[PDB]
Amino acid sequence: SACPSGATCGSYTVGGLGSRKQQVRNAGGSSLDLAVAMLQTERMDTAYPYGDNKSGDAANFGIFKQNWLMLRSACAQFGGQGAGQYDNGAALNSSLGQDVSCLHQSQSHYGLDAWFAGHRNGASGLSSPNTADIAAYKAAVYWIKAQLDADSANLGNDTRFWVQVPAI
Ligand SMILES: *[C@@]1(O[C@H]2[C@H](O)[C@H](O)[C@H](O)O[C@@H]2CO)O[C@H](CO)[C@@H](O[C@@H]2O[C@H](CO)[C@@H](O[C@@H]3O[C@H](CO)[C@@H](O[C@@H]4O[C@H](CO)[C@@H](O)[C@H](O)[C@@H]4O)[C@H](O)[C@@H]3O)[C@H](O)[C@@H]2O)[C@H](O)[C@@H]1O
Ligand SMILES: [Cl-]
Known part of the structure; x- marks a missing residue:
């Protein structure tokens, strides 16, 4: 819910993302892997x-x-x-x-x-x-993972959780 130490964060809906999450999981992706993917792109x-x-x-x-x-x-x-x-x-x-x-x-x-x-x-x-x-960066990923871990609906729904991590 509240953002990780000073950062901006939030969530929003991405059409088709739930089905994509399921595909990633079936390919062997764990919740940590899903969190890493979720930080990088919107549609994985x-x-x-x-x-x-x-x-x-x-x-x-x-x-x-x-x-x-x-x-x-x-x-x-x-x-x-x-x-x-x-x-x-x-x-x-x-x-x-x-x-x-x-x-x-x-x-x-x-x-x-x-x-x-x-x-x-x-x-x-x-x-x-x-x-x-x-x-x-690690904190951002683990905050996203915590959102996924806290409610298993988030493993298969269209919700993207994000933390702003400047690109380098
Ligand atoms: C992503 O954007 C998010 C955003 O943070 C927010 O959540 C928003 O709501 O959603 C966006 C996605 O829709 O933010 C991430 C994090 O910044 C971006 O990540 C980028 O990609 C990777 C993986 O995270 C990382 O790339 C590395 O970059 C470094 C630095 O350039 C490279 O390191 C170099 O390596 C060279 C070879 O060894 C070396 O010579 C050199 O000295 C240096 O060490 C490294 O190789 C990778 O390229 C990085 O985290 C990057 O920002 C993501 O693209 C998207 O913007
Ligand atoms: Cl160091």
Whole structure:
């Protein structure tokens, strides 16, 4: 209900989102995964600009906006690949199952603390993971997760819960 430490937050309806939440869950997404996805886009989709307008290791793919550094470091299907091969990450834009599998491989590779740091701030986050900005990003995700956990209707309805987290 009340927003996380100083932040703006709220909720609104997105047509079709409930059916999409169900698809994400059936692909293996947990409530934490749904909260991460919910922060990134409204419809849990990949129609955002290619790479989220970033190239190389910072390029974002899939519904979670995973970056290429983390994908190539953690996920078997990208093993051994380099920063310049980032266009290969676009496979996740058309395969939800692979997107979720890669998310789980990445979270296990890093552990969740480091994972949040890299997911928010890339290589700079991995080497400086305990910043105020990373903590606020994590807090936003866990606040969204709390809304999902508090009422299971939110796992399948059209409601989007959000916290304003400035883009970087
Ligand atoms: C999203 O917007 C929300 C909004 O916050 C609010 O909730 C509103 O109601 O709804 C909107 C959605 O409809 O907000 C998130 C959070 O800001 C945006 O996230 C963006 O995407 C990812 C995942 O969260 C992150 O991207 C990283 O960005 C960093 C910094 O550029 C990159 O780090 C670099 O990595 C390089 C390679 O290693 C390295 O050389 C460099 O030094 C640096 O370390 C990293 O690779 C990722 O690209 C980030 O969180 C980003 O803002 C989301 O797009 C949307 O706006
Ligand atoms: Cl730090």
